[PDB]
DNA sequence: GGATCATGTAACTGGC
């Protein structure tokens, strides 16, 4: 895991400065080592003469320099992949939902974006031997569509105790794009105390359509969204968590997701879920750096996402 | 219930600013805490130096941060669900129409969308022990199809006095999509004085088809509809009311509702009502985050929506 | 290849000064001969009386003066051009990706910018007879989208041993625009020990959008980007390497790359990759000093970039 | 013993 920022005290930085960084939003040596000098200068008391030291001290602990592709490949092969609850889907994602990267599943209504985010909120608590991620879940909602009774229905399918599952899911609701980005700063706090394995934002773009209405507000909403998606990338790098965000679609004037190019570039995996028949949906890999563009065929059963009981 | 915005006076904000917010459309601390900084800046007198304070003061009263899924589940289990007037329907919706979320029932003509909205306007006044919601009703109409004589016919079935029922239903007619959105701002006013348990918009999209005619006006009508549906979500969150909106259908060129993706995403529950035989209709769950896609079989009797008297 | 800066010791400069230059960022006589007097003065110990000598001594070894266009043309005709993995693309680039110049491929998501950078990371190790570049690869990533399993899939297609290929690719991740420019200084170190044939930055502008947010920060981000792109040009001139950088696009408010004029001028070749159908993309020459503006039609197969298997 | 001037980018539905 990541080293808490209090470790920096043992290096030459007084607690007055460290406690100035924790108030800014840094609760981990990684989060400071990743930050550029410009952000440290931007703190009310962190003078230039300090930030140069803080950065040079933090870089001593974390590896910034190069490495051969072998160490990366060997380390990457040990990355956790949370099971989706569907053998057909994991066969498509080659194991499951990666961690340390941003996955985005978009699709027309009813296609089960919130349902996948609900099983993932549970299976991410399974032991690694069972495909899970061995950690708590973190569910930021922007719709009011968080239904814990759907967490129990899948918790019982996997044998876990419904009591503990509803205790290892930290829920919060965003009421506007400002609160939504603010909950991420409070998220970095909680993520250094307990171990989280999955952070969910559902939906990641639902509030941006309405908070920025005028045609002149469009360039400002994509840039506010860009910082939000970058904040999400910082949590994945620093905490080794798995970020799953949910998008919405729009008609090409056939379905095409919203958010624009800023979200299509930032996302590493895009899953396009369309409805098939009855309760069986069709997930297709829209974008990925390693998976071939293919399709699967999962379902939405009374016990969460599963396979098409045909 | 929600705290009126005058409570904010006891914190450091002068009445000149509070009375500037009430003129904007905020009559509740929640409605201010949910609003983003951008909207407060947009008021004629609320400078940046104030909005940062107003937001930071309002957030002290209402909970914005995280919480475990247990507190949510325990609190969610105590949510009110208004009876539909049909045992078969409540068995489908698992208790009745939820509050604090947007329910949408669409369907071909005659299929009883206005009739369901008429019984709901009455049963939402029943005591909670009888399945109701213990509160007044709020009926925005965009068709002229509000018939109070149908409110009496169901008021007498439930034993309530027809006099009081027609006194606890606040009716208003929208003549265009602008007036329709304007009535919501006057709705937040009335909802903080009295206690409302149900807000109805029938129909929610009937006026959008005609107010925006040209093919180039389509992107502007979906965005005006997006703000309207977001205004509806703010009332459900802030006032804990139950929003029921009515849609229309169109032929796939078999029935498919209008409004597009902006209304399908925003709605949490979509009910598809088709005609069966005689006076018996068939409600089917088109979209929901917790209910399985099933069907029921209600009817339209002389005393409102009921069960198929077979 | 380029002469290491220790060769300058055999001329009249003491090791104290040379070791002062290597700490600055010069590890090659060329890199010193190219540097202006102003930069040498800027070192903590290199007085004016030294820099004039160091420059005049370095210029004795490397050719700075004029030459006829014949020697250049004869020498230019012997420049290496790394194969893209697609016969259709090499026919467009007339042989492949040039070395000693900055190539930039931009395009909407999914269009295979990271995939091209992945095959190029492998084929640049092929012997020159097979179209490669006979050298190691250098992959600076700013997205976390470096997938070594895609390096193996193309390594096996070309018969090379997957073990050695993942040993000749030096990977590093940039977490902000400061670290990104810092990795170039550590790159000049490694490039004088081993022989590199290709340096990759993917993406070259992804971090600049977010690190500089305010409208007033725009003039400072283009200038920080200008130095970065100049650092890239110094590596191409001094080390004879091939620099391939990846850009992102934005909507004209159809696709137009970001970075502004500073990156459009600095780039010598700009390739515009759009999606065609299925797995077949379309690369078009946006800017080049010698190639006509044409298009090709490659693909993204399970073994990397290739030709459209039609 | 004794004063003085100059530049630089960025998305979005609707029957017979
Ligand atoms: N308990 C359940 N058992 C079976 N199916 C269910 C259950 N709860 C919901 N569903 C089904 O799951 C689907 C709802 O999916 P979900 O709520 O994830 O959609 P979504 O992509 O979030 O949509 P939107 O854009 O409207 O928010 C519907 O088909 C619904 O019938
Ligand atoms: N008093 C009544 N007793 C019995 N049935 C009635 C009564 N009033 C209306 N109905 C029936 O209810 C149906 C009308 O339903 P309703 O007005 O809710 O339709 P709707 O979905 O709003 O339609 P539209 O799209 O045309 O507005 C018809 O079948 C009509 O015969
Ligand atoms: N192993 C594979 N086999 C076949 N196709 C693949 C494979 N891995 C990825 N792809 C395809 O390659 C494309 C991804 O391209 P790439 O990752 O290079 O895009 P990009 O230009 O970097 O995008 P972005 O801006 O999102 O980073 C997708 O169409 C994906 O389906
Ligand atoms: Ca949802
Ligand atoms: Ca992407
Ligand atoms: Ca009606
Ligand atoms: Ca919905
Ligand atoms: Ca990429
Ligand atoms: Ca150029």
Swiss-Prot record, chains A, B, C:
InterPro entries with a match to the protein in the record = AAA+_ATPase, DNA_recomb/repair_Rad51, DNA_recomb/repair_Rad51_C, DNA_recomb/repair_RecA-like, DNA_repair_Rad51/TF_NusA_a-hlx, P-loop_NTPase, RecA_ATP-bd, RecA_monomer-monomer_interface
Record keywords: Acetylation, ATP-binding, Chromosome, Cytoplasm, Cytoskeleton, Disease variant, DNA damage, DNA recombination, DNA repair, DNA-binding, Fanconi anemia, Isopeptide bond, Mitochondrion, Nucleotide-binding, Nucleus, Phosphoprotein, Ubl conjugation
Q: Which organism is it from?
A: Homo sapiens (Human)
Region annotated Interaction with PALB2 sits at 164-237
Short name of one Pfam family:
HHH_5
Main localisation, per the record?
Answer: nucleus
User: Which disease is reported for it?
Assistant: Breast cancer: A common malignancy originating from breast epithelial tissue. Breast neoplasms can be distinguished by their histologic pattern. Invasive ductal carcinoma is by far the most common type. Breast cancer is etiologically and genetically heterogeneous. Important genetic factors have been indicated by familial occurrence and bilateral involvement. Mutations at more than one locus can be involved in different families or even in the same case.
Impact when changing residue 114 to N: In MRMV2; likely pathogenic
The post-translation modification note in this UniProt entry reads: Ubiquitinated by the SCF(FBH1) E3 ubiquitin ligase complex, regulating RAD51 subcellular location and preventing its association with DNA. Ubiquitinated by RFWD3 in response to DNA damage: ubiquitination leads to degradation by the proteasome, promoting homologous recombination.
Summarize tissue expression. Answer: Highly expressed in testis and thymus, followed by small intestine, placenta, colon, pancreas and ovary. Weakly expressed in breast.
Q: Where in the cell is it found?
A: Nucleus; Cytoplasm; Cytoplasm, Perinuclear region; Mitochondrion matrix
Q: What protein family does this chain belong to? A: Belongs to the RecA family. RAD51 subfamily.
**Phosphothreonine found at:** 280
Q: Which GO terms describe its molecular function?
A: ATP binding; ATP hydrolysis activity; ATP-dependent activity, acting on DNA; ATP-dependent DNA damage sensor activity; chromatin binding; DNA polymerase binding; DNA strand exchange activity; double-stranded DNA binding
Summarize the record's induction comment.
Stress-induced increase in the mitochondrial levels is seen.
CDD domains, per this entry? Answer: Rad51
Record remark: domains? The nuclear localization may reside in the C-terminus (between 259 and 339 AA).
Protein name (Swiss-Prot/TrEMBL): DNA repair protein RAD51 homolog 1
